[PDB]
Design an enzyme around this catalytic site. Structure first.
Site, PDB file in Angstrom:
ATOM      1  N   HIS A  40       0.890 -14.250  -7.356  1.00  0.00           N
ATOM      2  CA  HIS A  40       1.657 -14.517  -8.573  1.00  0.00           C
ATOM      3  C   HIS A  40       1.857 -15.999  -8.756  1.00  0.00           C
ATOM      4  CE1 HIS A  40       4.354 -14.158 -11.843  1.00  0.00           C
ATOM      5  NE2 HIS A  40       5.465 -14.372 -11.160  1.00  0.00           N
ATOM      6  N   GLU A  96     -16.705   7.443  11.253  1.00  0.00           N
ATOM      7  CA  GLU A  96     -16.545   8.006   9.936  1.00  0.00           C
ATOM      8  C   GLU A  96     -17.332   7.132   8.997  1.00  0.00           C
ATOM      9  OE1 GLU A  96     -12.529   8.992   9.567  1.00  0.00           O
ATOM     10  OE2 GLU A  96     -12.722  10.147   7.715  1.00  0.00           O
TER      11      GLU A  96
HETATM   12  C1  HEM Z   1       3.567   5.000   8.274  1.00  0.00           C
HETATM   13  C2  HEM Z   1       2.450   5.449   7.719  1.00  0.00           C
HETATM   14  C3  HEM Z   1       1.641   6.479   8.387  1.00  0.00           C
HETATM   15  C4  HEM Z   1       2.060   7.539   9.176  1.00  0.00           C
HETATM   16  C5  HEM Z   1       3.475   7.867   9.570  1.00  0.00           C
HETATM   17  C6  HEM Z   1       0.927   8.315   9.600  1.00  0.00           C
HETATM   18  C7  HEM Z   1       1.024   9.458  10.428  1.00  0.00           C
HETATM   19  C8  HEM Z   1      -0.075  10.193  10.873  1.00  0.00           C
HETATM   20  C9  HEM Z   1      -0.066  11.263  11.803  1.00  0.00           C
HETATM   21  C10 HEM Z   1       1.139  11.831  12.506  1.00  0.00           C
HETATM   22  C11 HEM Z   1      -1.341  11.706  11.968  1.00  0.00           C
HETATM   23  C12 HEM Z   1      -1.803  12.821  12.869  1.00  0.00           C
HETATM   24  C13 HEM Z   1      -1.788  14.162  12.133  1.00  0.00           C
HETATM   25  C14 HEM Z   1      -3.183  14.541  11.716  1.00  0.00           C
HETATM   26  O1  HEM Z   1      -4.158  13.836  12.064  1.00  0.00           O
HETATM   27  O2  HEM Z   1      -3.367  15.568  11.027  1.00  0.00           O
HETATM   28  C15 HEM Z   1      -2.161  10.915  11.150  1.00  0.00           C
HETATM   29  C16 HEM Z   1      -3.518  11.084  11.064  1.00  0.00           C
HETATM   30  C17 HEM Z   1      -4.295  10.170  10.380  1.00  0.00           C
HETATM   31  N1  HEM Z   1      -3.906   9.097   9.678  1.00  0.00           N
HETATM   32 FE1  HEM Z   1      -2.142   8.520   9.410  1.00  0.00          FE
HETATM   33  N2  HEM Z   1      -0.183   7.775   9.096  1.00  0.00           N
HETATM   34  C18 HEM Z   1       0.170   6.692   8.356  1.00  0.00           C
HETATM   35  C19 HEM Z   1      -0.640   5.832   7.639  1.00  0.00           C
HETATM   36  C20 HEM Z   1      -2.008   5.942   7.650  1.00  0.00           C
HETATM   37  C21 HEM Z   1      -2.856   5.016   7.056  1.00  0.00           C
HETATM   38  C22 HEM Z   1      -2.428   3.772   6.331  1.00  0.00           C
HETATM   39  C23 HEM Z   1      -4.138   5.459   7.272  1.00  0.00           C
HETATM   40  C24 HEM Z   1      -5.360   4.791   6.830  1.00  0.00           C
HETATM   41  C25 HEM Z   1      -5.647   3.605   7.345  1.00  0.00           C
HETATM   42  C26 HEM Z   1      -4.065   6.665   8.003  1.00  0.00           C
HETATM   43  C27 HEM Z   1      -5.147   7.394   8.401  1.00  0.00           C
HETATM   44  C28 HEM Z   1      -5.016   8.529   9.192  1.00  0.00           C
HETATM   45  C29 HEM Z   1      -6.200   9.271   9.617  1.00  0.00           C
HETATM   46  C30 HEM Z   1      -7.632   8.947   9.289  1.00  0.00           C
HETATM   47  C31 HEM Z   1      -5.754  10.291  10.355  1.00  0.00           C
HETATM   48  C32 HEM Z   1      -6.587  11.352  11.017  1.00  0.00           C
HETATM   49  C33 HEM Z   1      -6.951  12.390   9.958  1.00  0.00           C
HETATM   50  C34 HEM Z   1      -7.648  13.558  10.597  1.00  0.00           C
HETATM   51  O3  HEM Z   1      -7.061  14.235  11.467  1.00  0.00           O
HETATM   52  O4  HEM Z   1      -8.813  13.851  10.252  1.00  0.00           O
HETATM   53  N3  HEM Z   1      -2.746   6.954   8.188  1.00  0.00           N
HETATM   54  N4  HEM Z   1      -1.372  10.007  10.469  1.00  0.00           N
END
Ligand code: HEM
Ligand SMILES: CCCCCCCCCCCCCCCCCC(=O)OC[C@H](COP(=O)([O-])OCC(O)COP(=O)([O-])OC[C@@H](COC(=O)CCCCCCCCCCCCCCCCC)OC(=O)CCCCCCCCCCCCCCCCC)OC(=O)CCCCCCCCCCCCCCCCC
Ligand SMILES: CCCCCCCCCCCCCCCCCC(=O)OC[C@H](COP(=O)([O-])OCC(O)COP(=O)([O-])OC[C@@H](COC(=O)CCCCCCCCCCCCCCCCC)OC(=O)CCCCCCCCCCCCCCCCC)OC(=O)CCCCCCCCCCCCCCCCC
Ligand SMILES: COC1=C(OC)C(=O)C(C/C=C(\C)CC/C=C(\C)CC/C=C(\C)CC/C=C(\C)CC/C=C(\C)CC/C=C(\C)CC/C=C(\C)CC/C=C(\C)CC/C=C(\C)CCC=C(C)C)=C(C)C1=O
Ligand SMILES: CCCCCCCCCCCCCCCCCC(=O)OC[C@H](COP(=O)(O)OCCN)OC(=O)CCCCCCCCCCCCCCCCC
Ligand SMILES: CCCCCCCCCCCCCCCCCC(=O)OC[C@H](COP(=O)(O)O)OC(=O)CCCCCCCCCCCCCCCCC
Ligand code: HEC
Ligand code: HEM
Ligand code: HEM
Ligand SMILES: COc1c(O)c(C)c(C/C=C(\C)CC/C=C(\C)CC/C=C(/C)CC/C=C(\C)CC/C=C(\C)CCC=C(C)C)c(O)c1OC
Ligand SMILES: COc1c(O)c(C)c(C/C=C(\C)CC/C=C(\C)CC/C=C(/C)CC/C=C(\C)CC/C=C(\C)CCC=C(C)C)c(O)c1OC
Lengths: 373, 98, 35, 48, 164, 66, 76, 238, 184, 54
Positions: free
Chosen positions: A194, A264
């Site tokens: 900005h 991925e």
């Molecule tokens: C505070 C913010 C975030 C929280 C609390 C969070 C929490 C979680 C948790 C608990 C899981 C495991 C559950 C699961 O895989 O089904 C997960 C999986 C994942 N999160 Fe996050 N997440 C956050 C932000 C992000 C961000 C910003 C990204 C991308 C960069 C991301 C990408 C993923 C991916 C790729 C998985 C695995 C998906 C899969 O199981 O195929 N998350 N997240």
């Protein structure tokens, strides 16, 4: 009012260029995707357990017993994929239109890109499938490259001899905590911008033609949010497993290893480069440079025109760069065998030579054609 | 070379927005000093041409072909003023090394 | 040029001192026994 | 119809009331209509 | 000035000493938990494996390949040119018993599990990037940097092997 | 009872595209017969033949299936 | 902020109220011509590169398979 | 190098096409009578069936038909009781090794997410179960193996489990090997995604809502952006 | 730098009264305590498991097997106590010296106080001891007092008929996420 | 502490459970490595599966 002063300054009475195309929507989409991820992540965190005995069981319990838990989980996964789609298009907009001359904004951007890649890597490790465990080991052993500092550091992250529960739990803690740092870095990203205002596709000084943001680029961001929500849901509710991998639906077996292992889609371009360099260390470095070459980008601008709207030779070089980025994404997928390897080696050579050498020389030639040089 | 420069001038496409070549220069410190030294009429025509090009890019249109900027006609007005800025800039620099 | 050379020669000694501090700091912090 | 503008669109308050009330009923209609479709599309396959 | 600054310098060292200590203990936290370290334990049964076969017991969270070799198997590995080996380690150099070879299953390259009884060198192959290990576990073809590791086992008997 | 697959298979199978494919496999089968003392196998020939056969069967097994 | 952004002179700017003008004036009337005008202006600078990509892709895939293909002379 | 299972015209292959629930019921019968001896549907519990292809009380029946131990008792470990609707499907070979032994080294892979875990699972499954063809020349499978062109390596420890008329469908639909492989592929699919049907309904509502909302939001944007898109600029140097 | 301006506008060239006593230190202490809590909380989160079978076991594993894990855990607990000491003295300074006439600052303060109390309550539930479980049931029951929607709300939060694993895991998520909202 | 560990070992261990304390924790507190190893090998574990999942 102090707050309203701030509010009016960044979203309502902010003077924006009148002629910015739909590509300028994408960064706002990224912010929305960030909130969406955080919200879905919070609703995954109320049932996920970061224990190697119970992580896969908790994920299946989310998908099968929590009311609409499959919806929130696949929204989280496909929202990570949508985040990387919008991130790549945001970076491509910044490269094409000469927006890297906002150097502080660009450097805060590449820091955000590194943080988002680390967050997505540890998040993909989190469900503790077959593919997550072998991916973690592989990507972490990569850190084992450094001769004196590397080995110990690896087990330090692994928190032990090899990735095991020690890792999973600390990866859950990091993956939880880094998107809030990403949100703070995005606030710094918005501030450093900005001060200078957004760029326009012609690359010229748009001070003569600026309009408000509330009624002109807000309804436009709302329409872009609606279209992005259409693509995400239609990638969750109809094609939910399109972007994922089937071997992640098996439990993590340290004794077996998925025969065909691949990062991925988003992490592939890098994967290709790493595989291309024969030396392990070389690969790691090149890999890093792959992302870092962007930061280096504002010092390579040798043209007197900011944007590529009036620069056809550098437009051709840019689309060749997008072309072999897609080629490197494909190669990463392909296994190790002829001739995938050679393409990978060339594609990496062509990628670094186009960004480092060909574009400034082309900009010098383009300045010579307009009787400027 | 002259015909190929006209072909590249058509391929660059800023003449279809009615712009000059010197309108397309990136405003660095030297370019802004050269713009500040312009006379009032040239500055006003430059600002109107930039505003019209921004409006045309907003509506995703171009000018009609009779209203485009003919390569031969384009005038390098900022150039003279710019050289000086660079010359002065360099002089100060060398003197610094003294 | 000559002036900047004078500047470098004048600050490099100071810079070396700073690096020295860092050497002690890094080593002490890293507890690298080789040192 | 100029009755609309005068009765529904003109005062923000009225503009709102119509939205909320309509939405309250829209769900009923949408769900009903949508379900009819979904089911028919796969009429044969469903518990009953 | 020297009195006032000496106090600033004194204080700094003190703070500096505490700051390194605080920061040090956290780094130690992320380090191996006492329990994780308590895994040096291991056991194997020689009778379990016959010639031309590999077996692993996931020792220390990693596949502990334990293999028996054939007359031919043992004969070729010796024939292998140690100097010409990517990693100079003659088959016997890594085995107390020619009929008995023991290796750790982490590809020198990126850490996958080599797949036994597959590959172009009759030893191992890692489906991750195509590293072929000979029966000795020496990297012969591919991008794997060094030979598979041989844990310091213990041949208490022709029937029991402590890997130690 | 006759598994519908058998029928569908027969049909696609009778096709010459497939017939000659099988024949190529036959030559391969025979090669290995005479060239019995080698390591050459007919797995690859087997797969290509099947891919064709199945593709077709698959094109037409679900219709018969109930 | 607004008011101190830039200095222009004698540039008159006319406009109309949203409700007074048609929402989609000649949307498909000129939209199509324009979209077509636009594509022909960048098509030669966008597609060519990706065309070659399709090509390398195909060649690459086919070549690999051939590599897997058993060598006739092999074993014979 | 692996045979790539072809595409079959599944009744759920379409974009809004749900699962055939009679086929899921028949495939659950196929799993219960054949596949449950070696494989474990760990993540599917009797209760899960209620609402898909078995009614509450009906499911209770199935539940009541199994013995599940209750470890904690005043002084005892197991008086396996009538399994309930909250009990999960009974896994054969309580310990993995047990099966390893029974299956000759193989470990039947829990078929809860097999379709999701296997590339092109539904097809693979069908193909594997129906791909038990003749081994070719030169092949030398190790003891206790069979030949399936699809299975990785073409050497699956699993012996061919579906012989025509292996089990009788209660519905009476002829139990041909295929009719059985298609039913168990539908069921395993259901297992790996019990929400398949519910989702597709959400996707249909999403497509209808986006088809309503995208042109209207586009019209609002083009209203608020018409003003500028009609702005006529004129330069009038004095 | 544009960012530097913020620093020199809030911490360096900020005109402060010359005669403010030591009580005006306390709010800055609160900010430090917040960071300290967050840092210690992060190093508790790399080993804590929010499962009712393993939560007490994970806490004992932190105290007994993690290197200096007892130090980080008791620093977290006594830092929560120090946070509330500094919070009470900050509020007492605001009440005594008439600082509540800064009305917006006071209202953002009482919002921060509510958020800190909720964070500390769920954090005390987190180790899953005897006292944590009976304490949680008690205050969750407090909600049931609501005249009409009370029962539902309680059950919602509990995530079930009575506090059980369902609660512990969502309390871990909420206790993790609220100190960043407190920082904002 | 060494004498009190003996007491548990002999008198109060048969009915109470020191679950969160393991033979490893004692080394460097009351016993050496070999003394604690002998103390641990006097006691016997009874679980953990075998080739037969036994
Ligand atoms: C505070 C913010 C975030 C929280 C609390 C969070 C929490 C979680 C948790 C608990 C899981 C495991 C559950 C699961 O895989 O089904 C997960 C999986 C994942 N999160 Fe996050 N997440 C956050 C932000 C992000 C961000 C910003 C990204 C991308 C960069 C991301 C990408 C993923 C991916 C790729 C998985 C695995 C998906 C899969 O199981 O195929 N998350 N997240
Ligand atoms: C060709 C057929 C359509 C036609 O003739 O209309 C002419 C018209 C071109 O008219 P023009 O005067 O040449 O251009 C002015 C714009 O149309 C002025 O309006 P606009 O089109 O810029 O509208 C705002 C814009 C705003 O766009 C966005 O906000 C995009 C946001 C990012 C993409 C979505 C996020 C996820 C991306 C994942 C990848 O919306 C779009 O661009 C929609 C593009 C749809 C493409 C066609 C397929 C449907 O074409 C369109 O309007 C396309 C949109 C409607 C279809
Ligand atoms: C349990 C509570 C835990 C509280 C933890 C945080 C306490 C922060 C205290 C900060 C502080 O005292 O430093 C400013 C204050 C500034 O120094 P000063 O100008 O000499 O102040 C004289 C009076 O304390 C100037 O006194 P004042 O008129 O500014 O106010 C009285 C002073 C407390 O002093 C008292 O006279 C009342 C003590 C009760 O205020 C408090 O510290 C309230 C503490 C409540 C407990 O430093 C000290 O009071 C401690 C000096 C320690 C020197 C050690 C030499 C070796
Ligand atoms: C081949 O595929 C690839 C991956 O694997 C799918 C990757 O993970 C990554 C990116 C990640 C790494 C190279 C290693 C990252 C390791 C972790 C994320 C686990 C350990 C995490 C931490 C120690 C803390 C989280 C990491 C942070 C915060 C990065 C910090 C850097 C900045 C903030 C800048 C890349 C580039 C990649 O190419
Ligand atoms: C995709 C193709 C989009 C397209 O339509 O191509 C032509 C278009 C021309 O844009 P331009 O020359 O600015 O003319 C605008 C006239 N109104 O081209 C554009 O609209 C400009 C697009 C610039 C950004 C393209 C980003 C493509 C994806 C890049 C991803 C990788 C980036 C690097 C990552 C590391
Ligand atoms: C602006 C965009 C708002 C979100 C998208 C709006 C259009 C789609 C609305 C739902 C349509 C629908 O399918 O309704 C029934 C369907 C529920 O099915 P029912 O319960 O059977 O009616 O609603 C859903 O689609 C649920 C998922 C909606 C997610 C919307 C995408 C944005 C998520 C942001 C999360 C933070
Ligand atoms: C008496 C033994 C036995 C019976 C009966 C049996 N299986 Fe299996 N199955 C196995 C074994 C053993 C494996 C793993 C072997 C391997 O992967 O090499 C297996 C694996 C599978 C796999 C996955 C294969 C892979 O590539 O991972 C599927 C799908 C499967 N079985 C389906 C079925 C179906 C459907 C039935 C009956 C309707 C069935 N099985 C009956 C022993 C059996
Ligand atoms: C966390 C992901 C990111 C988000 C949410 C994000 C969001 C935004 C937003 C909202 C803008 C304002 C432009 C607009 O919306 O019209 C913007 C501008 C910009 N971003 Fe990003 N961005 C992200 C990542 C990046 C990265 C990785 C880079 C560097 C490669 C980058 C470089 C820029 C630049 C240079 C600008 C100024 C361009 C302009 O506005 O004209 N951003 N970003
Ligand atoms: C985001 C930052 C924070 C994280 C990640 C975090 C994490 C944790 C974790 C994992 C525990 C369980 C281990 C334990 O028993 O201590 C815990 C407990 C606790 N936390 Fe936090 N916490 C955070 C912030 C706070 C704050 C700001 C407070 C004070 C308001 C607080 C007060 C507590 C208390 C009182 C306990 C229980 C201590 C005990 O076991 O006796 N936490 N926290
Ligand atoms: C015209 O130039 C601008 C612009 O100046 C700004 C400030 C924004 C920022 C506005 C948004 C709606 C994006 C919000 C940015 C974020 C980083 C969201 C952060 C999310 C958090 C949870 C923090 C733009 O999107 C934009 O172009 C459209
Ligand atoms: C004169 O008035 C002021 C004043 O204006 C400021 C900025 C500060 C500085 C405030 C702090 C140093 C505390 C900052 C508070 C935080 C919560 C820091 C951020 C913490 C996070 C975890 C984020 C004062 O201490 C002060 O009184 C003397």
């Amino acid at each position: 009012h102090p707050l309203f002063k701030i509010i009016n300054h960044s979203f309502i009475d902010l003077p924006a260029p009148s002629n910015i195309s739909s590509w300028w929507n994408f960064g706002s989409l990224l912010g929305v995707c960030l909130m969406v991820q955080i919200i879905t992540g919070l609703f995954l965190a109320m049932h996920y357990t970061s224990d190697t005995m119970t992580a896969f069981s908790s994920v299946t319990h989310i998908c099968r017993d929590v009311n609409y838990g499959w919806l929130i989980r696949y929204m989280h996964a496909n929202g990570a994929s949508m985040f990387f789609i919008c991130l790549f298009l945001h970076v491509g907009r910044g490269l094409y239109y000469g927006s890297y001359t906002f150097m502080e904004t660009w450097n805060i951007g590449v820091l955000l890109l590194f943080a988002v890649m680390a967050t997505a890597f540890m998040g993909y490790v989190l469900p503790w499938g077959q593919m997550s465990f072998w991916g973690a080991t592989v990507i972490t052993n990569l850190l084992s490259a450094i001769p004196y500092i590397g080995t110990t550091l690896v087990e330090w992250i692994w928190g032990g001899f090899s990735v095991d529960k020690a890792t999973l739990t600390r990866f859950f803690a990091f993956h939880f905590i880094l998107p809030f740092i990403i949100a703070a870095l995005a606030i710094v990203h918005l501030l450093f911008l900005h001060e200078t205002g957004s760029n326009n596709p012609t690359g010229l000084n748009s001070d003569a033609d600026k309009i408000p943001f509330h009624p002109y680029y807000t309804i436009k961001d709302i329409l872009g949010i609606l279209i992005m929500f259409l693509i995400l849901m239609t990638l969750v509710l109809f094609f939910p497993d399109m972007l994922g991998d089937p071997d992640n639906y098996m439990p993590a077996n340290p004794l077996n290893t998925p025969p065909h292992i691949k990062p991925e889609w988003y992490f592939l371009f890098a994967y290709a480069i790493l595989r291309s360099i024969p030396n392990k260390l070389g690969g790691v470095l090149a890999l890093i440079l792959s992302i870092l070459i962007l930061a280096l980008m504002p010092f390579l601008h040798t043209s007197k025109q900011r944007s590529l709207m009036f620069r056809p030779i550098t437009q051709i070089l840019y689309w060749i760069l997008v072309a072999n980025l897609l080629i490197l994404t494909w190669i990463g997928g392909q296994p190790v065998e002829h001739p995938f390897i050679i393409i990978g080696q060339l594609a990496s050579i062509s990628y670094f030579s186009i960004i480092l050498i060909l574009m400034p020389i082309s900009g010098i030639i383009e300045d010579k054609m307009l009787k400027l040089y | 070379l002259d015909g190929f420069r006209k072909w590249y001038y058509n391929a660059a496409g800023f003449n279809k927005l009615g712009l000059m070549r010197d309108d397309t220069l990136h405003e660095t410190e030297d370019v802004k000093e050269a713009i500040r030294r312009l006379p009032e009429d040239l500055y006003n025509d430059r600002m109107f041409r930039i505003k019209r090009a921004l409006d045309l890019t907003m509506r995703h249109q171009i000018l009609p072909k009779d209203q485009w900027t003919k390569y031969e006609e384009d005038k390098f007005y900022l150039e003279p003023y710019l050289k000086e800025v660079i010359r002065e800039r360099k002089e100060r620099e060398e003197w610094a090394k003294k | 040029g000559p002036r900047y050379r004078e500047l470098a020669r004048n600050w490099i000694p100071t810079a070396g001192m700073w690096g020295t501090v860092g050497a002690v700091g890094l080593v002490w912090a890293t507890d690298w026994r080789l040192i | 119809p100029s009755r609309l503008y005068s009765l529904l669109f003109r005062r923000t308050s009225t503009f709102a009331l119509t939205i909320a009330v309509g939405a309250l009923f829209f769900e009923r209609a949408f769900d009903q209509g949508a379900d009819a479709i979904y089911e028919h599309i796969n009429e044969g396959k469903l518990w009953k | 000035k020297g009195f006032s600054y000496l106090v600033t310098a004194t204080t700094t060292v003190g703070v500096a000493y505490a700051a390194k200590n605080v920061v040090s203990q956290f780094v130690s936290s992320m380090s191996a938990s006492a329990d994780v370290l308590a895994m040096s334990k291991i056991e194997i049964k020689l009778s379990d494996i016959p010639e031309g076969k590999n077996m692993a017991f996931k020792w220390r969270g990693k596949p502990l390949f334990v293999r028996h070799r054939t007359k031919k198997e043992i004969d070729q590995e010796a024939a292998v040119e140690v100097s010409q080996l990517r990693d100079p380690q003659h088959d016997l150099d890594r085995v107390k018993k020619p009929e008995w070879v023991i290796l750790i299953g982490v590809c020198t390259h990126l850490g996958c599990v080599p797949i036994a009884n597959a590959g172009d060198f009759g030893g191992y192959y890692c489906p991750c990037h195509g590293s072929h290990y000979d029966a000795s576990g020496r990297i012969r073809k591919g991008p794997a940097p060094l030979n598979l590791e041989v844990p310091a086992y213990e041949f208490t008997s022709d029937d029991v092997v402590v890997v130690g | 009872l006759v598994d519908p697959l058998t029928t569908v298979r027969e049909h696609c199978e009778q096709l010459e595209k497939c017939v000659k494919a099988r024949e190529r496999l036959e030559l391969c089968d025979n090669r290995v017969s005479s060239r019995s003392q080698t390591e050459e196998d007919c797995t690859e020939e087997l797969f290509d033949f099947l891919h064709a056969r199945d593709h077709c069967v698959a094109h037409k097994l679900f219709k018969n299936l109930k | 902020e607004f008011g101190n952004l830039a200095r222009i002179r004698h540039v008159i700017s006319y406009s109309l109220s949203p409700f007074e003008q048609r929402a989609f004036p000649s949307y498909f009337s000129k939209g199509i011509p324009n979209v077509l005008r636009r594509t022909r202006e960048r098509i030669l600078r966008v597609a060519p590169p990706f065309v070659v990509v399709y090509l390398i892709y195909t060649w690459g895939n086919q070549e690999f398979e051939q590599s897997k293909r058993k060598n006739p002379a092999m074993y014979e | 190098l692996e045979l790539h299972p072809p595409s079959y015209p599944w009744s759920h292959r379409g974009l809004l096409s749900s699962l055939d629930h009679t086929s899921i019921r028949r495939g659950f019968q196929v799993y219960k009578q054949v596949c449950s001896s070696c494989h474990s549907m760990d993540y599917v519990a009797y209760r899960h069936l209620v609402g898909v292809c078995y009614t509450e009380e009906e499911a209770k029946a199935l539940a009541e038909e199994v013995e599940v131990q209750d470890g904690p008792n005043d002084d005892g470990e197991m008086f396996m009781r009538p399994g309930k609707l909250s009990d999960y499907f009974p896994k054969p070979y309580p310990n993995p090794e047990a099966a390893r032994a029974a299956n000759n080294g193989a470990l039947p892979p829990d078929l809860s997410y097999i379709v999701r875990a296997r590339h092109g699972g539904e097809d693979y499954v069908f193909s594997l179960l129906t791909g038990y063809c003749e081994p070719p020349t030169g092949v030398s499978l190790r003891e206790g193996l069979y030949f399936n062109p699809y299975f990785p390596g073409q050497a699956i420890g699993m012996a061919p489990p579906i012989y025509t008329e292996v089990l009788e469908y209660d519905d009476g639909t002829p139990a041909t090997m295929s009719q059985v492989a298609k039913d168990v592929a539908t069921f395993l699919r259901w297992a790996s995604e019990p929400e398949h049907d519910h989702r597709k309904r959400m996707g249909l509502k999403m497509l209808l809502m986006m088809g309503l909302l995208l042109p209207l939001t586009y019209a609002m944007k083009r209203h608020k952006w018409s003003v500028l898109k009609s702005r006529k600029l004129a330069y009038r140097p004095p």
